[PDB]
Scaffold this active site. Structure first.
Site, PDB file in Angstrom:
ATOM      1  N   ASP D  44       0.837  -1.190   0.000  1.00 46.99           N
ATOM      2  CA  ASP D  44       0.000   0.000   0.000  1.00 46.99           C
ATOM      3  C   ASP D  44       0.875   1.243   0.000  1.00 46.99           C
ATOM      4  O   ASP D  44       1.778   1.374   0.832  1.00 46.99           O
ATOM      5  CB  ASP D  44      -0.933   0.012   1.208  1.00 46.99           C
ATOM      6  CG  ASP D  44      -1.888   1.180   1.183  1.00 46.99           C
ATOM      7  OD1 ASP D  44      -2.828   1.162   0.360  1.00 46.99           O
ATOM      8  OD2 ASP D  44      -1.699   2.116   1.984  1.00 46.99           O
ATOM      9  N   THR D  77      -5.766   6.344  -2.340  1.00 43.25           N
ATOM     10  CA  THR D  77      -4.683   7.215  -1.901  1.00 43.25           C
ATOM     11  C   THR D  77      -3.597   7.329  -2.961  1.00 43.25           C
ATOM     12  O   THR D  77      -3.061   8.416  -3.200  1.00 43.25           O
ATOM     13  CB  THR D  77      -4.096   6.703  -0.589  1.00 43.25           C
ATOM     14  OG1 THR D  77      -5.158   6.302   0.283  1.00 43.25           O
ATOM     15  CG2 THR D  77      -3.293   7.797   0.082  1.00 43.25           C
ATOM     16  N   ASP D 355     -12.557   0.914   7.444  1.00 43.95           N
ATOM     17  CA  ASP D 355     -12.736   0.878   5.993  1.00 43.95           C
ATOM     18  C   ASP D 355     -14.213   0.881   5.624  1.00 43.95           C
ATOM     19  O   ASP D 355     -14.637   1.592   4.704  1.00 43.95           O
ATOM     20  CB  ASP D 355     -12.052  -0.359   5.411  1.00 43.95           C
ATOM     21  CG  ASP D 355     -10.543  -0.286   5.482  1.00 43.95           C
ATOM     22  OD1 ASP D 355     -10.016   0.754   5.927  1.00 43.95           O
ATOM     23  OD2 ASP D 355      -9.882  -1.274   5.099  1.00 43.95           O
TER      24      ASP D 355
END
Lengths: 50, 503, 492, 487, 478
Positions: D44, D77, D355
């Site tokens: 990530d 992101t 989330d």
């Protein structure tokens, strides 16, 4: 680079040493002699003819 | 290795010293390019007066240190035009080097410059077309103070400022001894204000606080103290008994003595002063030290900080009844003006610029020399370079009927004086050679000695109608104390510098 | 720190031109934002289109450029916005002057030309500074014009309506003489720029809690000294006794609100509420000055001499809670001038920016309430000054005729860079504007919302005369001040 | 001016391309041992950007974009960085062609609002709260994890927590403010409960009565200290009023309730829990209504908070938790009582519940939904190209420059899934120009197909917020033209 | 490569800048170290000719000055200085990011206004109006600038004023003629009717001849055919006795057996003069040029009437008088150095060329640079009118027109920043008749002081300078 510590170099070094200190007081002879200026190093200006 | 000595020493110092002159020769004249002043700390200001320039600069060579030493010994003499002494120093040193090219000994150059100065000052007395009746000259004193303010827009308030100057030299006019002393310091410059608020107050307005911050300020009575009295719950109860004691013994000793407006310089509690306010008498806490003479002269007394010596004839003293708001946005300051005249007198300046503060103190002191030289020796010379050209012509004329080699000094002398009308014409943005030699030809065809260089860019080169006026003491001191130091530099050859380890 | 002749004036000009270039791009309503690093450890990479914070934040060690920065500070405290243009015009005049010294012209002749050129520009401003009917016949939209042009590169485009409404109530009510003390600006966080509305007081609530009543009517209100209370323990205890004697001296008034500046802990607050006294601790001191005149309560150290009726007297003071935040509306002042404005937005720089920009807007509005004469902006006035100085240079003989012409170029370079930062074409339009202004008279000027020549009196882009005369005069004086000064201890 | 703008372009493009391969679920992990030993093994890119040693301004503004996109929607992101870096790379052609950056920035603003209005009606929106499609988005989000077996354990709990309070925050959207969350180490994963009101997890061990129906609550932050004067008066005030459950704070000193005052507070056996968490203290006060007061003389009779059932109860057999109902305005942040004997079933459960929160607040702030995975980017790159063909002036290329920079998101999705990127992208363009919007690259099986059948879908506000933030920072960096150090 | 073109042209314009105006200071034409010894020159025209120019763009400016050279004579320096000043102006406009084609168009429409504004002040003199003398003596004197020959300057204006009655057919510059020897000064020139070659048979050849029909000769078992060629050249000398001529041009070399046999037949054979004088021999006396002379037998010869050859004062002072078209008014000075040989010839060509331009068209404008200021103010007024970027391109076209009276004041030793600017300000209202006086160094009425200049050189300067500017500005590479 000049090394002078043998006898004739000894006397030659000695008389060059007297000649330079004579030149340090050469101009001050007489009543109207030239002034020489020295300091102390910190800013104490001394003009002398003596 | 290397060892600089002999005549090559004299070559090296001159190009040193005239370099300092080369810094200052662009500052000559009121149209001279005025110049910054930046400290090592980082402060920044602007100044036109060359004495502040040379003093607050820090030089490296000892000839320049000698130069600023001697020219600070000219600031007490004149203070005005001390730049020109440095300019003439560089000029005479350059011409002396030119004579040294032909082999003349510098002792002969020095006393030849001395003989040329003995031509110079006496010919300055010959061309002295001065007006000696300048005592009650209140109308030409406007023109006297006019050229001192000429570089700025202070001429637009010279109907205030020059009249302040004439009233200032009127009030200090001791008609027999003719001097500003250390007590007669003429400055109160309020940083912040305008052009006209620099005005006429002969009194003391200092930034000290009040007795009480809502007290009626009307203390008309001259019964006024100044104290040397410092501050020097049983601890605080004994100190409060000392406090009401200090009331009923210091203030009652005052009631025996007469020291009423108790301006204490030290610690105090104002509730005793508030009870004095209920008994209607003032007393200020924590006032400044050395203003006792300035306050006390305001009727004629002197410094009286004592408990007991401040009596009814040597009180804290007061000038003239007026009540204006001193601090408009600032705290309103002390009204120490009620009663009589101030001999050690001091004027109200409200100049917002540091330039106009610096000029209105030091050009007023220069007035206090040259209007002293309207009483001490009332001899004026028409300046603007006209004195220098008229002098140089006669120096060259006296360089004809003299049979010695010393003659070549005098011709080297006069041309050196030509740097003064050159730098006047160079800083005014004109041709420096042609203007000065045209004025010289106009003088050799017309015998008026008041034909100078048009620095103000007015009508003609005649300094009569524009009144560019110096005094003869200010000219003579300038030329003589340039010659007395050119001889000093020329008499010094060997700077054997200490601590600079001669190998 | 000595220098030499060729070096010192050159590096002075380079430093001043560099400062004017560092406020070059942030000019006009098309500003390119510069980033102010202060390297440190975690200096925020802050963007700004206002140049005053740049020159405030520039750490400059060239002292001629420090003089330029200081003159920008004088213009900053004088009018507010426009110091970017003042510094740009001054550096432009210096760039013009060093080209003249490259042609070997004496600096005194340059100053002598610039002085009468500045006088000609100062009267050419009066030649077209017509007084609009925004205060004569009471137009509102022209107040919006003058309070829109100085409101460029700001946040309050929503409540520029509210700021111009404050200008209407300033020319109607809040004129002391155009009161520059009523400028009262507060905001908190949460929301956007569309939350500005009216108040008349600062934001501090009842510190007893919600138990203190809202309508504490007749506030006899000043500053106290210490908190009230009931051998070091005994010396502070007898001080506590004297302070309770002092609350017995202040309770006989019957006050409602009060400003005790020092930090108040528990039983001082308890004896405040027992005596009905408010304790307000170190607000914006200009707002306490508005509490000192618009309300009445002046600053004070002790209170031993004001004892019965010797205080500031007002009619009505409340401390409320609106919108779940410390929003306090001091409704009921004696003189309704200090109308506070409360916003609730996003960032914290607007706490200074809205206050200083309302100070700027109300400063130029105060210029209008002294004199509502105004010229047409967008560089039209700059073209008028350049044309007048150019014609006076065409008349004047002597060397000084050079020194005026570059001066006119320094005017003509002013609207060019605003076009250059516009992204639109600059040289062709400024040339067309100049050629049009030479014969198609002064009502025509530059519009950058469309990027064209046009009638500025029709499009209404105004600019007050008292800021423009100030800009031209201050820029010319700063340029002449540094131009007089060449080779000293001037720089390192 | 241009030489510093080009450096901003190059630095932001280089810091965007350092995480460009990490786009998509097949985005490979990194390793940068920059600094002093960072073993940065993670797929990530958000935590990669949070550990990047960044010295350049324009490289730091994309790190600000990362946190801004995580605040607004919590997802996408790396997309807001890759779109911005590709846009800033495409600005170099407009700069070298001759366009000033103001025109470039305003044309990007026009292309941004055109792309937002194009994306907002090409969606498949939801009409009601539609808890079935909330559970569908939960299958898109709460699964593909280790909480895949905890997906039905966690999704309808939060769905019912929003069903309880469809809370009026940003046009009745999901805030972080439904019903206050806690978490307890130990227990099983099935030991999660949905509560009504305040819960405390910390260990209160009182032998006496803490179980009062009118559980009066105060927040006295004044603990005990060491020199009797400023010590026992708060307990005397407790004996005055009777606040039987009071949360203790050690803001004064460390000996919080010594036996002098502790037996005084165990002569009626008050609830005692110390070192209360600072950000949740104000939420606890928003729940209760008491005042967070440490000055013991500021303790008043209106500081009496309300509570109905307050027990040190062993929830789920052994968890001695302090649950509280019946408050002034409880309900502070959506309750999932994360219990788990293992640590990974604690942290992944709470992270996946966050989330779920950041996607259900995305599902109802904007109540539309699109097929994610490269399809709306290809749709924007088609429609904005047509619009830039219709558009005149120097902006006509810049919106076109906005179009091609949109194409990096499918191509990376084509590249990270192992497909040949350029050919699959233009084949997707040919399929979309004559077919549908929802055609894209199914990364979950690795093939180009209709995604709405293969179910890789996302709420609309993720894409809208990512495009908005990327265009904002691209606009700003284009307008940035000068920097200066040495204040 | 567009910057180095400007640099190469600016250097060439600088190497005539300090020679501009009749206070110009001389340069040194030192050269290849064999015999380079020295060359001082005020004439900037011969400076660029002896420059070995390196940059090929500067070669274009050199040949534009060469086009100016054969047109009127003096004027190469003004054109080169004006063009290099235009390029120094244009490179400042290029760095402000203006396209060169706009600058070229601005040059063109500015040069149109500067051309017609010369015509607005087109003042015609009274030598071709009321038959005055001194007004054309002014332009005949200022074309003799940076020279010496002011004593017989009145003889130069005599050859000018006798041209309008005798030596103009259309302002003929072929009937003029200059030669000189050394020893003497300015006071030796006078009226002659041709070249300086003498009778050559010797003490027996008499002075006055009857009729000179005059053309070109040819020349003067192997040995027998050599004697046969001698017989053929002897047949030629029999064929020339039956002519009746008394002079002949002998373009090829000849020894005594042809020569004495010519002169005994009455043939004076003039050995190979320079062909420029033989041009005056061709029609102004009337004797043509060939190579063979077999076919002229009585009819195809030259035609003249009288040719005489005298010997006065150390020269070969032959006065070729009595020709059929008596127009070859020849100047024979006896100068000081070798430099006056080309100087007097080229300066009379430069003078009498624009004097022939005046006997074509006697309009003149006041010199001393005030016409440059008038064109500058005229293009500045048009710069204030038109919009667009080209309004900038007019302004720099003004500036070079300010620099042309500046440099004239600059090489005068005087200041030039003030009174050129004072002249620019005074020309806006104190109209065109004012101007700069270089000799006394002030501002005065140029119409009163009579410092004028022919219009047919001012238009040729102001047009061709911008013509040279627009060519080299449009070139960018190589």
């Amino acid at each position: 680079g000049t090394d002078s510590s043998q006898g004739i170099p000894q006397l030659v070094s000695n008389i060059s040493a007297c000649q330079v200190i004579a030149e340090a007081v050469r101009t001050t002879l007489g009543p109207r002699g030239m002034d020489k200026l020295i300091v102390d190093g910190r800013g104490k200006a001394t003009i002398s003819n003596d | 290795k290397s060892r600089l000595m002999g005549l090559e020493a004299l070559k090296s110092h001159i190009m040193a010293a005239k370099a300092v002159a080369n810094t200052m020769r662009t500052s000559l004249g009121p149209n001279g390019l005025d110049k910054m002043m930046v400290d090592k700390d980082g402060d920044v200001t602007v100044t036109n007066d060359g004495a502040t320039i040379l003093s607050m600069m820090d030089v490296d060579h000892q000839i320049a240190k000698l130069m600023v030493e001697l020219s600070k010994s000219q600031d007490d003499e004149i203070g005005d035009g001390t730049t020109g002494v440095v300019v003439l120093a560089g000029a005479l040193l350059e011409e002396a080097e030119q004579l040294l090219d032909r082999g003349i000994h510098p002792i002969r150059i020095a006393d030849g410059y001395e003989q040329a100065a003995r031509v110079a000052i006496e010919h300055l007395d010959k061309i002295s077309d001065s007006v000696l009746v300048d005592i009650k000259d209140t109308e030409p004193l406007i023109q006297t103070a006019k050229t001192t303010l000429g570089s700025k827009v202070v001429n637009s308030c010279h109907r205030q400022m020059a009249e302040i100057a004439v009233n200032a030299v009127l009030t200090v006019a001791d008609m027999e001894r003719r001097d500003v002393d250390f007590e007669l310091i003429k400055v109160e410059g309020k940083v912040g204000g305008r052009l006209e608020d620099t005005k006429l107050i002969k009194g003391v307005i200092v930034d000290k606080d009040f007795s009480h911050p809502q007290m009626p300020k009307k203390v008309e009575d001259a019964k006024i103290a100044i104290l040397t009295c410092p501050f020097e719950v049983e601890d605080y109860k004994a100190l409060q008994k000392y406090e009401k004691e200090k009331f009923e013994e210091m203030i009652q000793q005052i009631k025996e003595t007469g020291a009423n407006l108790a301006i204490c310089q030290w610690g105090f509690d104002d509730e005793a002063n508030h009870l004095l306010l209920q008994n209607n008498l003032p007393a200020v806490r924590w006032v400044g030290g050395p203003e006792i003479e300035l306050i006390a002269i305001a009727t004629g007394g002197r410094i009286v900080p004592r408990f007991s010596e401040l009596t009814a004839e040597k009180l804290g003293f007061a000038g003239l009844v007026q009540e204006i708001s001193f601090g408009t946005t600032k705290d309103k300051m002390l009204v120490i003006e009620q009663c009589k005249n101030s001999r050690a007198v001091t004027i109200f300046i409200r100049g917002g610029n540091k330039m106009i503060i610096e000029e209105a103190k030091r050009s007023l002191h220069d007035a206090l020399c040259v209007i002293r030289n309207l009483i001490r020796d009332n001899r004026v010379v028409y300046g603007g370079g006209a004195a220098e050209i008229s002098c140089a012509l006669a120096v060259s004329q006296e360089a004809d009927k003299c049979p010695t080699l010393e003659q070549y000094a005098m011709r080297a002398f006069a041309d050196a004086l030509e740097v003064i009308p050159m730098a006047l014409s160079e800083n005014s943005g004109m041709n420096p050679i042609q203007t000065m030699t045209e004025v010289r030809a106009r003088q050799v065809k017309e015998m008026n000695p008041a034909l100078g260089i048009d620095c103000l860019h007015k009508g003609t080169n005649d300094m009569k109608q524009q009144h560019v006026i110096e005094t003869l003491i200010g000219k003579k001191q300038q030329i003589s104390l340039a010659t007395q130091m050119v001889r000093m530099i020329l008499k010094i050859d060997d700077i054997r510098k200490p601590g600079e380890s001669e190998e | 720190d000595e220098e030499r002749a060729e070096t010192a004036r050159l590096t002075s000009f380079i430093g001043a031109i560099a400062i004017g270039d560092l406020v070059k791009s942030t000019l006009g309503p098309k500003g390119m934002d510069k980033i102010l690093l202060s390297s440190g450890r975690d200096a925020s990479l802050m963007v700004t289109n206002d140049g005053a914070t740049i020159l405030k934040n520039i750490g400059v060690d060239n002292p001629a450029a420090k003089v330029l920065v200081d003159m920008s500070r004088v213009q900053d405290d004088e009018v507010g916005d426009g110091t970017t243009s003042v510094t740009v015009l001054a550096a432009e005049l210096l760039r013009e002057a060093e080209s003249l010294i490259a042609k070997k012209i004496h600096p005194q002749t340059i100053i002598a030309g610039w002085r009468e050129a500045t006088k000609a520009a100062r009267e050419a401003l009066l030649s077209s500074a017509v007084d609009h009917g925004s205060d004569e016949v009471k137009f509102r939209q022209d107040l919006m014009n003058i309070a829109g042009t100085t409101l460029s590169s700001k946040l309050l485009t929503h409540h520029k309506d509210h700021f111009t409404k404050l200008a209407v109530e300033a020319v109607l009510r809040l004129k002391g003489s155009g009161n520059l003390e009523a400028i009262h600006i507060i905001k908190k966080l949460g929301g956007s720029l569309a939350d500005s509305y009216l108040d008349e007081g600062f934001l501090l609530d009842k510190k007893i809690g919600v138990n203190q009543p809202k309508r504490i009517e007749n506030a006899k209100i000043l500053i106290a000294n210490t908190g009230m209370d009931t051998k070091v323990a005994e010396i502070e205890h007898a001080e506590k006794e004297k302070m309770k004697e002092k609350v017995e001296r202040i309770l006989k008034h019957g006050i409602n609100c009060f400003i005790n500046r020092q930090l108040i802990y528990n039983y001082p607050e308890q004896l405040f509420g027992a005596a009905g006294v408010m304790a307000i601790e170190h607000a914006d001191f200009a707002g306490v000055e508005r509490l000192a005149l618009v309300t009445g309560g002046e600053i004070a150290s002790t209170f031993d001499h004001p004892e019965l009726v010797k205080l500031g007297s007002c009619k009505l003071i409340e401390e409320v809670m609106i919108g779940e935040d410390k929003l306090i509306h001091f409704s009921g002042v004696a003189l309704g001038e200090a109308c506070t404005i409360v916003l609730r937005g996003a960032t914290q720089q607007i706490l200074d920016e809205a206050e200083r920009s309302l100070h700027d807007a109300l400063c130029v509005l105060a210029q209008t309430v002294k004199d509502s004469r105004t010229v047409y902006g967008g560089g039209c006035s700059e073209m008028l000054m350049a044309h007048a100085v150019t014609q006076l240079a065409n008349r004047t003989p002597g060397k000084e005729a050079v020194a005026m012409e570059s001066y006119a170029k320094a005017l003509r370079m002013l609207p060019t860079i605003i076009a250059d930062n516009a992204g639109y074409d600059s040289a062709d339009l400024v040339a067309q504007l100049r050629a049009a202004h030479s014969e198609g008279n002064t009502t025509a000027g530059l519009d950058m919302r469309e990027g064209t020549i046009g009638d500025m009196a029709i499009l209404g882009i105004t600019e007050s005369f008292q800021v423009k005369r100030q800009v031209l005069l201050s820029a010319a004086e700063a340029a002449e001040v540094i131009l007089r000064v060449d080779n000293i201890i001037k720089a390192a | 001016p241009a030489q510093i703008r080009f450096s901003n372009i190059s630095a932001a493009k280089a810091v965007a391309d350092a995480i460009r391969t990490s786009l998509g679920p097949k985005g490979m992990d990194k390793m940068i041992q920059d600094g002093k030993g960072d073993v940065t093994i993670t797929n990530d890119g958000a935590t990669i950007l949070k550990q990047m040693q960044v010295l350049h301004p324009a490289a730091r503004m994309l790190v600000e974009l990362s946190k801004a996109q995580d605040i607004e929607a919590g997802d996408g992101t790396t997309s807001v960085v890759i779109i911005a870096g590709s846009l800033l790379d495409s600005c170099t052609k407009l700069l070298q062609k001759g366009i000033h950056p103001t025109i470039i920035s305003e044309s990007f603003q026009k292309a941004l609002e055109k792309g937002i209005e194009i994306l907002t009606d090409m969606s498949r929106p939801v009409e009601l709260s539609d808890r079935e499609t909330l559970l569908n988005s939960a299958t898109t989000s709460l699964n593909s994890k280790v909480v895949s077996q905890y997906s039905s354990l966690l999704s309808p709990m939060s769905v019912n927590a929003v069903m309880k309070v469809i809370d009026p925050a940003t046009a009745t959207s999901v805030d972080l403010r439904d019903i206050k969350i806690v978490k307890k180490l130990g227990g099983t994963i099935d030991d999660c409960e949905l509560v009504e009101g305040l819960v405390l997890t910390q260990k209160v061990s009182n032998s006496g009565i803490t179980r009062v129906e009118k559980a009066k609550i105060g927040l006295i932050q004044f603990c005990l200290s060491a020199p009797r004067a400023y010590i026992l008066n708060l307990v005397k005030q407790i004996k005055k009023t009777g606040c039987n459950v009071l949360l203790i704070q050690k803001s004064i000193l460390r000996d919080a309730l010594s036996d002098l005052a502790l037996h005084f507070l165990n002569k009626m056996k008050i609830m005692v829990i110390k070192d209360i968490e600072r950000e949740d203290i104000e939420f606890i006060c928003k729940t209760i209504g008491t005042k967070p007061v440490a000055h013991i003389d500021q303790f008043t009779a209106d500081m009496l908070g309300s509570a109905e059932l307050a027990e040190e109860v062993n929830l789920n057999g052994s968890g001695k938790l302090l649950k509280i109902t019946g408050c002034a305005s409880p309900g502070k942040t959506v309750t999932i009582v994360v219990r788990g004997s293992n640590k990974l079933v604690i942290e992944e459960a709470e992270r996946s519940i966050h989330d779920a929160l950041c996607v259900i607040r995305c599902l109802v702030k904007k109540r539309a939904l699109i097929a994610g995975g490269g399809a709306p980017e290809i749709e924007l790159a088609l429609r904005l190209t047509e619009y830039s063909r219709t558009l005149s002036g120097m902006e006509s290329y810049c919106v076109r420059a906005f179009a091609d920079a949109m194409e990096v998101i499918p191509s990376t999705l084509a590249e990270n899934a192992g497909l040949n990127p350029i050919s699959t992208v233009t084949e997707l363009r040919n399929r979309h120009a004559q077919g549908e919007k929802t055609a894209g690259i199914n990364v979950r099986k690795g093939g180009i197909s209709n995604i709405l059948e293969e179910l890789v879908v996302q709420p609309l506000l993720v894409s809208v917020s990512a495009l908005t933030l990327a265009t904002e920072t691209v606009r700003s960096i284009l307008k940035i033209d000068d920097v200066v150090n040495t204040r």
